[PDB]
């Protein structure tokens, strides 16, 4: 669950940010990318489909591994929008908060 | 995730399924939706508050992940069960589409 680049992000592109705001959020986004790339991501599901034999333990395990990774990624995504909103005016913040809610 | 009905699902729509195959896979799809609906089911506040709440963020994220784990389990189970009514050629195509996803 990655936030798009600010230039591509629907949540921020319609905010009418100043150049100073743009620079700060770009820095936050690079740092988001840096952090997520550091999350350890160490064919399982396809084999059980291919074998025709259900392997309950292997499925639960692979899915727990993937959920654990995604969870961590989502932690940084949440922080990213939290940090981003610090550089906003109250109006902009309310727009961001509303946009995030609509995404649910 | 959740998988669409067979006619709208990129993984199975190009398989050239028979009416008998479609009827069965749709019953599986119906059971999948039922099962997922039976899964027992914060972040906005931190934006509004401006105060980071680390424990609350992590809690919400753990609860959501536990749910998505369960939903993905049924999604995998769905394609496993689905493939039982397919021909060996169809079955191979489904595995290839899933890996790509
Ligand atoms: Na606009
Ligand atoms: Na870097
Ligand atoms: Na997950
Ligand atoms: Na179909
Ligand atoms: Na997750």
Give me the DSSP letters along B38-51. Answer: TS---HHHHHHH--
Distances (CA, A) of A32 to A51, A65, A79, B101: 39, 21, 9, 24
Question: Taking a C-beta distance cutoff of 8 angstroms, is the pair A97, A15 a contact?
Answer: no
Q: Mark which residues 27-86 of B lie under 8 Å from A by CB.
A: 43-44, 46-48, 50, 52, 57-58, 61-62, 64-66, 68-69, 72-73, 76-77, 79-80, 83-84
Cα–Cα dist B27/B22, whole Å: 9
Question: Taking a C-beta distance cutoff of 8 angstroms, is the pair A1, A77 a contact?
Answer: yes
Query: If 0-12 CB within 10 Å is exposed, 13-18 middle and 19+ buried, where does residue B51 land?
Result: exposed
Number of other residues whose CB lies within 10 A of the CB of residue A48: 19
- Spatial neighbors of A26 by CB under 8 A, at least 6 apart, are A6
The experimental method is X-ray
Resolution of the structure, angstroms: 2.2
**DSSP one-letter string for A61-86:** HHHHHHHHHHHHHHHHHHHHHHHHHT
- Give distance in angstroms: CA of A94 to centre of ligand 4: 44
Q: Which of chain B's residues have a Cβ under 8 Å away from the Cβ of A59?
A: 73, 76-77
Cα–Cα dist A54/A23, whole Å: 51
Q: How many CA atoms lie within 13 A of B97 on its CB side?
A: 15
Q: How many CA atoms lie within 13 A of A65 on its CB side?
A: 12
- CB contact under 8 Å between B95 and A46, yes or no, is yes
Joined together, the tokens standing for residue A39 give 């999350």
């Amino acid at each position: 669950p990655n936030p798009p680049l600010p230039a591509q992000d629907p949540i921020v592109q319609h905010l009418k940010l100043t150049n100073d705001q743009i620079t700060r959020i770009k820095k936050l986004h690079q740092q988001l990318e840096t952090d997520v790339s550091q999350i350890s991501m160490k064919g399982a599901l396809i084999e059980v489909i291919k074998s025709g034999k259900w392997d309950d333990a292997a499925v639960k395990q692979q899915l727990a591994a993937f959920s654990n990774i995604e969870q961590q990624a989502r932690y940084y995504r949440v922080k990213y929008y939290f940090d981003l909103s610090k550089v906003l005016t109250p109006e902009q913040r309310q727009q961001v908060q509303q946009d995030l809610a609509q995404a649910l």
